[PDB]
Paper text:
The virus exploits its trimeric spike (S) glycoprotein to adsorb to the host cell-surface receptor, angiotensin-converting enzyme 2 (ACE2), resulting in proteolytic processing and conformational changes required for membrane fusion and cell entry. Here, we take advantage of available sequences of five SARS-CoV-2 RBD–directed sybodies: Sb14, Sb15, Sb16, Sb45, and Sb68 (previously designated Sb#14, Sb#15, Sb#16, Sb#45, and Sb#68, respectively). These sybodies effectively inhibit the ACE2–RBD interaction and neutralize viral infectivity, and a bispecific construct, consisting of Sb15 linked to Sb68, blocked ACE2 binding and neutralized both pseudotyped and infectious SARS-CoV-2 viruses. Each of the sybodies represents an immunoglobulin variable-type fold consisting of two β-sheets packed as a β-barrel linked by a disulfide bond.
We also obtained a 1.9 Å structure of free Sb16. Remarkably, CDR2 of Sb16 shows Y54 in starkly different positions in the unliganded structure as compared with the complex: the Cα carbon is displaced by 6.0 Å, while the Oη oxygen of Y54 is 15.2 Å distant, indicative of dynamic flexibility. Our new structures increase the understanding of the details of sybody interactions with the RBD, and in the case of Sb16, emphasize the dynamic role played by CDRs in adjusting to epitopic surfaces. Here, we report five X-ray crystal structures of sybodies (synthetic nanobodies) including those of binary and ternary complexes of Sb16–RBD, Sb45–RBD, Sb14–RBD–Sb68, and Sb45–RBD–Sb68, as well as unliganded Sb16. These structures reveal that Sb14, Sb16, and Sb45 bind the RBD at the angiotensin-converting enzyme 2 interface and that the Sb16 interaction is accompanied by a large conformational adjustment of complementarity-determining region.
Residue numbers in the entry: 1 to 116
């Protein structure tokens, strides 16, 4: 019943921007803390950003993306967004959103490729 679906990835050149979406279903997005993470091919998973559930606002970013990425939420559309500006090739990876409703639930991921 709980389902996350990432989208918005693609192929851009260094310096461009993307906007990832995490469409949630089977539960209300606004009442859960959600994270974005990413996994590059030859490496292991890296936390990217987090947004606190509704009540006291709190957003957090990995140091390597702070100032370039913005996480935000649309409670009506039940969606979490990651605005990514000033993209670098080091940002190339599959991006996932994750929430814990008892267990953890993540999506299939969305591919972000940044060419130099």
């Amino acid at each position: 019943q709980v389902q996350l679906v990432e989208s918005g990835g693609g192929l851009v050149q260094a310096g461009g921007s993307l906007r990832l979406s995490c469409a949630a279903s089977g539960f209300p997005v606004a009442y859960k803390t959600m994270w974005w993470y990413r996994q590059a091919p030859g490496k292991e998973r890296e936390w990217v950003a987090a947004i606190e559930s509704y009540g006291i606002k709190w957003t957090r970013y990995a140091d390597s993306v702070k100032g370039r990425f913005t996480i935000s939420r649309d409670n009506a559309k039940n969606t979490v967004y990651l605005q990514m500006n000033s993209l670098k090739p080091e940002d190339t990876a599959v991006y996932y959103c994750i929430v814990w409703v008892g267990a953890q639930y993540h999506g299939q991921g969305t591919q972000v490729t940044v060419s130099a």
